[PDB]
mmCIF file of C-alpha atoms and ligand atoms in Angstrom:
data_model
loop_
_atom_site.group_PDB
_atom_site.id
_atom_site.type_symbol
_atom_site.label_atom_id
_atom_site.label_comp_id
_atom_site.label_asym_id
_atom_site.label_seq_id
_atom_site.Cartn_x
_atom_site.Cartn_y
_atom_site.Cartn_z
ATOM 1 C CA UNK A 1 -16.682 -34.976 -33.499
ATOM 2 C CA UNK A 2 -18.849 -31.656 -32.617
ATOM 3 C CA UNK A 3 -22.766 -32.191 -32.189
ATOM 4 C CA UNK A 4 -23.309 -28.814 -30.759
ATOM 5 C CA UNK A 5 -22.381 -26.602 -28.037
ATOM 6 C CA UNK A 6 -21.357 -27.882 -24.678
ATOM 7 C CA UNK A 7 -24.202 -27.861 -22.035
ATOM 8 C CA UNK A 8 -23.726 -27.193 -18.299
ATOM 9 C CA UNK A 9 -26.453 -28.211 -15.703
ATOM 10 C CA UNK A 10 -26.482 -25.692 -12.520
ATOM 11 C CA UNK A 11 -28.562 -25.953 -9.802
ATOM 12 C CA UNK A 12 -29.505 -22.594 -7.593
ATOM 13 C CA UNK A 13 -29.496 -23.547 -3.852
ATOM 14 C CA UNK A 14 -30.253 -21.363 -0.732
ATOM 15 C CA UNK A 15 -32.649 -20.421 1.906
ATOM 16 C CA UNK A 16 -36.243 -19.233 1.133
ATOM 17 C CA UNK A 17 -36.324 -15.613 -0.340
ATOM 18 C CA UNK A 18 -32.937 -14.823 -0.860
ATOM 19 C CA UNK A 19 -33.309 -14.193 -4.495
ATOM 20 C CA UNK A 20 -32.561 -17.362 -6.310
ATOM 21 C CA UNK A 21 -35.336 -16.830 -8.868
ATOM 22 C CA UNK A 22 -34.487 -13.059 -8.997
ATOM 23 C CA UNK A 23 -30.955 -13.936 -10.120
ATOM 24 C CA UNK A 24 -31.864 -16.304 -12.604
ATOM 25 C CA UNK A 25 -34.605 -14.296 -14.099
ATOM 26 C CA UNK A 26 -32.216 -11.074 -14.347
ATOM 27 C CA UNK A 27 -29.858 -13.486 -16.147
ATOM 28 C CA UNK A 28 -32.019 -14.880 -18.841
ATOM 29 C CA UNK A 29 -34.923 -11.901 -19.098
ATOM 30 C CA UNK A 30 -32.836 -8.782 -17.828
ATOM 31 C CA UNK A 31 -35.946 -7.974 -15.708
ATOM 32 C CA UNK A 32 -36.106 -7.669 -11.786
ATOM 33 C CA UNK A 33 -39.211 -9.345 -10.075
ATOM 34 C CA UNK A 34 -40.018 -7.013 -7.340
ATOM 35 C CA UNK A 35 -42.983 -9.418 -6.160
ATOM 36 C CA UNK A 36 -41.982 -12.778 -4.113
ATOM 37 C CA UNK A 37 -43.385 -15.889 -5.707
ATOM 38 C CA UNK A 38 -42.367 -19.004 -3.969
ATOM 39 C CA UNK A 39 -40.677 -21.452 -6.357
ATOM 40 C CA UNK A 40 -40.962 -25.458 -6.254
ATOM 41 C CA UNK A 41 -39.466 -25.982 -9.154
ATOM 42 C CA UNK A 42 -38.404 -24.218 -12.447
ATOM 43 C CA UNK A 43 -36.210 -24.874 -15.422
ATOM 44 C CA UNK A 44 -34.359 -22.192 -17.686
ATOM 45 C CA UNK A 45 -31.965 -22.247 -20.430
ATOM 46 C CA UNK A 46 -29.242 -19.501 -22.138
ATOM 47 C CA UNK A 47 -26.864 -19.668 -24.531
ATOM 48 C CA UNK A 48 -23.509 -17.535 -23.348
ATOM 49 C CA UNK A 49 -19.835 -17.307 -24.744
ATOM 50 C CA UNK A 50 -17.607 -17.881 -21.849
ATOM 51 C CA UNK A 51 -13.727 -17.483 -22.449
ATOM 52 C CA UNK A 52 -14.287 -17.875 -25.998
ATOM 53 C CA UNK A 53 -16.611 -21.037 -25.694
ATOM 54 C CA UNK A 54 -20.058 -21.083 -26.669
ATOM 55 C CA UNK A 55 -22.224 -22.880 -24.359
ATOM 56 C CA UNK A 56 -25.514 -23.827 -22.943
ATOM 57 C CA UNK A 57 -26.429 -23.341 -18.994
ATOM 58 C CA UNK A 58 -29.319 -25.339 -18.114
ATOM 59 C CA UNK A 59 -30.450 -23.795 -14.844
ATOM 60 C CA UNK A 60 -32.700 -25.245 -12.065
ATOM 61 C CA UNK A 61 -34.159 -23.169 -9.776
ATOM 62 C CA UNK A 62 -35.111 -24.793 -6.105
ATOM 63 C CA UNK A 63 -37.370 -24.150 -3.564
ATOM 64 C CA UNK A 64 -36.128 -22.865 -0.524
ATOM 65 C CA UNK A 65 -38.598 -24.340 1.950
ATOM 66 C CA UNK A 66 -38.371 -28.064 1.067
ATOM 67 C CA UNK A 67 -38.468 -31.228 3.551
ATOM 68 C CA UNK A 68 -37.027 -34.515 2.633
ATOM 69 C CA UNK A 69 -38.158 -35.374 -1.300
ATOM 70 C CA UNK A 70 -36.330 -38.070 -3.335
ATOM 71 C CA UNK A 71 -36.931 -35.878 -6.189
ATOM 72 C CA UNK A 72 -34.851 -33.109 -4.712
ATOM 73 C CA UNK A 73 -31.873 -35.402 -4.611
ATOM 74 C CA UNK A 74 -32.466 -36.684 -8.120
ATOM 75 C CA UNK A 75 -31.464 -32.933 -9.454
ATOM 76 C CA UNK A 76 -28.799 -32.607 -7.126
ATOM 77 C CA UNK A 77 -27.077 -35.710 -8.297
ATOM 78 C CA UNK A 78 -27.589 -34.880 -12.209
ATOM 79 C CA UNK A 79 -26.444 -31.188 -11.172
ATOM 80 C CA UNK A 80 -22.871 -30.760 -12.413
ATOM 81 C CA UNK A 81 -22.110 -27.244 -10.382
ATOM 82 C CA UNK A 82 -23.963 -25.421 -7.489
ATOM 83 C CA UNK A 83 -24.846 -21.556 -6.771
ATOM 84 C CA UNK A 84 -25.320 -21.538 -3.113
ATOM 85 C CA UNK A 85 -27.081 -18.378 -2.387
ATOM 86 C CA UNK A 86 -27.685 -16.405 0.705
ATOM 87 C CA UNK A 87 -28.872 -12.933 1.205
ATOM 88 C CA UNK A 88 -26.363 -10.231 2.981
ATOM 89 C CA UNK A 89 -29.187 -9.317 5.308
ATOM 90 C CA UNK A 90 -30.562 -12.309 6.310
ATOM 91 C CA UNK A 91 -27.870 -14.495 8.915
ATOM 92 C CA UNK A 92 -29.877 -17.487 9.041
ATOM 93 C CA UNK A 93 -29.743 -17.818 5.178
ATOM 94 C CA UNK A 94 -25.830 -17.131 5.593
ATOM 95 C CA UNK A 95 -25.615 -20.301 8.405
ATOM 96 C CA UNK A 96 -28.550 -22.518 6.090
ATOM 97 C CA UNK A 97 -25.371 -22.614 3.204
ATOM 98 C CA UNK A 98 -23.334 -25.112 5.575
ATOM 99 C CA UNK A 99 -26.362 -27.429 5.299
ATOM 100 C CA UNK A 100 -26.982 -27.132 1.436
ATOM 101 C CA UNK A 101 -23.149 -27.811 1.113
ATOM 102 C CA UNK A 102 -23.287 -30.810 3.304
ATOM 103 C CA UNK A 103 -26.548 -32.167 1.614
ATOM 104 C CA UNK A 104 -24.458 -31.563 -1.931
ATOM 105 C CA UNK A 105 -21.199 -33.505 -0.787
ATOM 106 C CA UNK A 106 -23.403 -36.370 0.732
ATOM 107 C CA UNK A 107 -25.587 -36.818 -2.661
ATOM 108 C CA UNK A 108 -22.859 -36.537 -5.036
ATOM 109 C CA UNK A 109 -20.696 -38.661 -2.588
ATOM 110 C CA UNK A 110 -17.487 -36.136 -3.108
ATOM 111 C CA UNK A 111 -15.543 -33.588 -1.222
ATOM 112 C CA UNK A 112 -14.915 -31.736 -4.661
ATOM 113 C CA UNK A 113 -18.120 -30.306 -5.986
ATOM 114 C CA UNK A 114 -18.010 -27.275 -8.214
ATOM 115 C CA UNK A 115 -20.098 -24.432 -6.453
ATOM 116 C CA UNK A 116 -20.010 -20.805 -6.028
ATOM 117 C CA UNK A 117 -21.002 -19.012 -2.646
ATOM 118 C CA UNK A 118 -23.090 -16.230 -3.936
ATOM 119 C CA UNK A 119 -24.307 -13.393 -1.304
ATOM 120 C CA UNK A 120 -27.144 -11.543 -2.754
ATOM 121 C CA UNK A 121 -28.918 -8.293 -2.383
ATOM 122 C CA UNK A 122 -25.898 -6.312 -1.855
ATOM 123 C CA UNK A 123 -28.233 -3.385 -2.901
ATOM 124 C CA UNK A 124 -29.843 -3.291 0.587
ATOM 125 C CA UNK A 125 -28.441 -1.203 3.769
ATOM 126 C CA UNK A 126 -29.150 -3.861 5.977
ATOM 127 C CA UNK A 127 -26.118 -5.775 5.853
ATOM 128 C CA UNK A 128 -25.874 -8.332 8.458
ATOM 129 C CA UNK A 129 -23.132 -10.703 7.089
ATOM 130 C CA UNK A 130 -19.803 -9.126 6.361
ATOM 131 C CA UNK A 131 -17.969 -9.308 2.939
ATOM 132 C CA UNK A 132 -15.142 -10.928 5.040
ATOM 133 C CA UNK A 133 -17.214 -13.679 6.849
ATOM 134 C CA UNK A 134 -18.342 -14.594 3.439
ATOM 135 C CA UNK A 135 -14.976 -14.804 1.757
ATOM 136 C CA UNK A 136 -13.388 -16.423 4.733
ATOM 137 C CA UNK A 137 -16.353 -19.153 4.673
ATOM 138 C CA UNK A 138 -15.844 -19.550 0.723
ATOM 139 C CA UNK A 139 -11.902 -19.880 1.519
ATOM 140 C CA UNK A 140 -12.629 -22.765 3.986
ATOM 141 C CA UNK A 141 -14.617 -24.531 1.181
ATOM 142 C CA UNK A 142 -11.977 -23.999 -1.683
ATOM 143 C CA UNK A 143 -14.545 -22.063 -3.570
ATOM 144 C CA UNK A 144 -15.276 -18.692 -5.154
ATOM 145 C CA UNK A 145 -17.526 -15.872 -3.436
ATOM 146 C CA UNK A 146 -19.196 -13.577 -5.123
ATOM 147 C CA UNK A 147 -21.469 -10.334 -4.117
ATOM 148 C CA UNK A 148 -24.661 -10.135 -6.018
ATOM 149 C CA UNK A 149 -27.797 -7.979 -6.448
ATOM 150 C CA UNK A 150 -30.632 -9.313 -8.803
ATOM 151 C CA UNK A 151 -31.980 -5.637 -8.648
ATOM 152 C CA UNK A 152 -28.988 -3.735 -9.793
ATOM 153 C CA UNK A 153 -27.437 -7.028 -11.908
ATOM 154 C CA UNK A 154 -24.314 -6.706 -10.262
ATOM 155 C CA UNK A 155 -22.267 -10.019 -10.122
ATOM 156 C CA UNK A 156 -25.054 -12.072 -11.895
ATOM 157 C CA UNK A 157 -23.366 -12.698 -15.095
ATOM 158 C CA UNK A 158 -20.311 -13.127 -13.002
ATOM 159 C CA UNK A 159 -21.847 -15.666 -10.565
ATOM 160 C CA UNK A 160 -22.967 -17.703 -13.474
ATOM 161 C CA UNK A 161 -20.059 -17.711 -15.674
ATOM 162 C CA UNK A 162 -17.684 -18.376 -12.444
ATOM 163 C CA UNK A 163 -19.740 -21.663 -11.957
ATOM 164 C CA UNK A 164 -19.205 -22.701 -15.268
ATOM 165 C CA UNK A 165 -15.132 -21.940 -15.004
ATOM 166 C CA UNK A 166 -15.254 -24.269 -11.938
ATOM 167 C CA UNK A 167 -17.374 -26.916 -13.677
ATOM 168 C CA UNK A 168 -14.511 -26.821 -16.507
ATOM 169 C CA UNK A 169 -11.768 -26.572 -14.145
ATOM 170 C CA UNK A 170 -13.460 -29.952 -12.179
ATOM 171 C CA UNK A 171 -13.023 -31.782 -15.748
HETATM 172 N N1 GNP B 1 -33.334 -5.637 -2.998
HETATM 173 C C1 GNP B 1 -33.334 -6.569 -3.397
HETATM 174 N N2 GNP B 1 -34.037 -7.453 -3.445
HETATM 175 C C2 GNP B 1 -34.059 -8.708 -3.678
HETATM 176 C C3 GNP B 1 -32.677 -9.057 -4.362
HETATM 177 N N3 GNP B 1 -32.842 -10.498 -4.847
HETATM 178 C C4 GNP B 1 -34.110 -10.545 -4.596
HETATM 179 N N4 GNP B 1 -34.872 -9.750 -4.289
HETATM 180 C C5 GNP B 1 -36.423 -9.890 -3.594
HETATM 181 O O1 GNP B 1 -36.325 -10.563 -2.454
HETATM 182 C C6 GNP B 1 -37.931 -11.316 -2.667
HETATM 183 C C7 GNP B 1 -37.529 -12.862 -3.293
HETATM 184 O O2 GNP B 1 -36.720 -12.917 -4.145
HETATM 185 P P1 GNP B 1 -36.880 -14.540 -4.952
HETATM 186 O O3 GNP B 1 -36.325 -14.402 -6.023
HETATM 187 O O4 GNP B 1 -38.350 -14.943 -5.044
HETATM 188 O O5 GNP B 1 -36.348 -15.423 -3.710
HETATM 189 P P2 GNP B 1 -36.476 -17.144 -3.791
HETATM 190 O O6 GNP B 1 -35.058 -17.597 -3.074
HETATM 191 O O7 GNP B 1 -36.271 -17.268 -5.244
HETATM 192 N N5 GNP B 1 -37.304 -17.550 -2.864
HETATM 193 P P3 GNP B 1 -37.948 -19.168 -2.865
HETATM 194 O O8 GNP B 1 -36.911 -19.996 -2.546
HETATM 195 O O9 GNP B 1 -39.295 -19.015 -2.256
HETATM 196 O O10 GNP B 1 -38.327 -19.626 -4.445
HETATM 197 C C8 GNP B 1 -38.499 -10.294 -3.892
HETATM 198 O O11 GNP B 1 -39.265 -9.925 -3.462
HETATM 199 C C9 GNP B 1 -37.122 -10.183 -4.478
HETATM 200 O O12 GNP B 1 -37.706 -8.857 -5.409
HETATM 201 C C10 GNP B 1 -32.050 -8.259 -4.498
HETATM 202 O O13 GNP B 1 -30.618 -8.667 -4.854
HETATM 203 N N6 GNP B 1 -32.061 -7.175 -4.072
HETATM 204 C C1 F8K B 2 -32.108 -32.986 -13.258
HETATM 205 O O1 F8K B 2 -31.062 -32.306 -12.856
HETATM 206 C C2 F8K B 2 -30.559 -31.010 -13.634
HETATM 207 C C3 F8K B 2 -30.011 -30.317 -12.694
HETATM 208 C C4 F8K B 2 -29.456 -29.098 -12.931
HETATM 209 C C5 F8K B 2 -30.073 -28.523 -14.178
HETATM 210 C C6 F8K B 2 -31.018 -29.442 -15.119
HETATM 211 C C7 F8K B 2 -31.421 -29.185 -16.433
HETATM 212 C C8 F8K B 2 -32.068 -27.749 -16.408
HETATM 213 C C9 F8K B 2 -32.902 -26.875 -17.576
HETATM 214 C C10 F8K B 2 -33.136 -28.104 -18.793
HETATM 215 N N1 F8K B 2 -33.525 -28.005 -20.162
HETATM 216 C C11 F8K B 2 -34.571 -26.641 -20.082
HETATM 217 C C12 F8K B 2 -34.567 -25.344 -20.080
HETATM 218 C C13 F8K B 2 -35.485 -24.643 -20.119
HETATM 219 C C14 F8K B 2 -36.680 -25.120 -20.826
HETATM 220 C C15 F8K B 2 -37.986 -24.283 -20.928
HETATM 221 N N2 F8K B 2 -38.481 -24.150 -21.887
HETATM 222 C C16 F8K B 2 -39.799 -23.630 -22.213
HETATM 223 C C17 F8K B 2 -37.614 -23.885 -22.929
HETATM 224 C C18 F8K B 2 -36.870 -26.601 -21.017
HETATM 225 C C19 F8K B 2 -35.761 -27.213 -20.725
HETATM 226 C C20 F8K B 2 -32.241 -29.400 -18.785
HETATM 227 O O2 F8K B 2 -32.368 -29.850 -19.809
HETATM 228 C C21 F8K B 2 -31.633 -31.197 -20.042
HETATM 229 C C22 F8K B 2 -31.472 -29.704 -17.709
HETATM 230 C C23 F8K B 2 -31.316 -30.878 -14.861
HETATM 231 MG MG1 MG B 3 -37.525 -18.555 -6.315
#
C-alpha cells in the first residue's frame, strides 16, 4: 500500500572544483553560485515528477579532495545512484572518473551500479575533453553521458532525471 512518494538516494561525486555543488544548487534553488566554497558533506532534497511518477530526490553532495574515511564508504554503500562529474576544461578531473567508478564498484560489490557521467562547465571556451571521448568512456561503462553547465542550467535537470531512470531500470 502507498505510504508516500518513492525516494531516491543520489550521490554526487567527482574531483575538487568540477561543479558538484553548483549543479545541485542550480537544481534546488535555481541559483548559480559563482564563489568556490569547498564542500565536506551537504544534504539536499527535492520533489520532482519524472515520467509521470512523483518522487523525492535525496541528494548527497560530496567533497572533491578526501582521503580514506569509513564515513565516505558508508554513504557510498547506501547511495542508489551516482552522478560522476568532471569538468570539460580539466583533463585530470576526467581521468579521475575511473577512480570514482572503481571506488563505487568496490563498496557496492557490484559491476552494475546506476550511474551517469556528467561533463560540467560546457559553457567555458577552454574545453580540453572532447564530447566524443566522454561518450566513448560512458559507452565502455554502459552508462549515459550528459553535458551540463551549472551556469546556463543546460542539462542540469536531465542529469538528475536520467540518473533516476537508471535506478528504476536497475530494479
Ligand atoms: N562557468 C562555470 N563555472 C562553473 C560551473 N560549475 C561550477 N562552476 C564554478 O566552479 C567553481 C567550483 O564549483 P563548485 O560547485 O564549488 O565545485 P565542487 O565540485 O562542489 N567543489 P568541491 O569538491 O570542493 O566541493 C565555482 O567558482 C563555480 O562557480 C559551470 O558549469 N560553469
Ligand atoms: C547515507 O547515504 C546517503 C546517500 C545518498 C543520499 C542520502 C540522503 C540525502 C539527503 C537526505 N535527507 C535530507 C535532505 C535534506 C535535508 C536538509 N533539511 C534542512 C531539509 C535533510 C535531510 C537523506 O535522508 C534520508 C538521504 C544518503
Ligand atoms: Mg562542493
